[PDB]
Amino acid sequence: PTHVAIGIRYRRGETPLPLVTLKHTDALALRVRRIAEEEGIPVLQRIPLARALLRDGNVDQYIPADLIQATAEVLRWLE
Amino acid sequence: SKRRQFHQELQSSNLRADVRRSSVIVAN
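Structure tokens for the assembled complex are given below, as produced in the milestone run.
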């Protein structure tokens, strides 16, 4: 799964839960990261979460309950 | 059907569009 890029959205008030916006691997995952630089979107490395998100997370749906803890940490780190 | 979510989801013109929707990208 060499490269992984999961997009997460949470704007407090619009989303009750963080919601997956995109899931990409390999070349598209790298394309996502380069676009994210150009758009001012922070790219955080969270390997166990990224792997889990890849497997469990579904685009345009809220994050799994199992990944609420780990997703909070990501957002929390950026505060 | 299972196709309905996909169609609904496929109202996104750009990869950049989806990246811009995002608050944060989680990578490995």
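The first strand of chain A starts at residue 4 and ends at 9. Helices of chain A lie at 26-39, 47-56, 68-78. Further analysis is deferred to the final report.
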